[PDB]
Amino acid sequence: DPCYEVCLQQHGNVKECEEACKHPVE
Numbered sequence: 001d002p003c004y005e006v007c008l009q010q011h012g013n014v015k016e017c018e019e020a021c022k023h024p025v026e
Contacts, residue, residue: 007017 003021004018007013007021011017013020
C-alpha cells in the first residue's frame with residue numbers, strides 16, 4: 001500500500017515499482 005504510494009509520489013512507476021517492491025533489489 002505505502003510502497004507503491006511512495007513511488008507514486010516520489011516517482012511515476014507502476015509494474016516496475018509494484019513488481020520491484022516485492023523483488024530483491026540489487
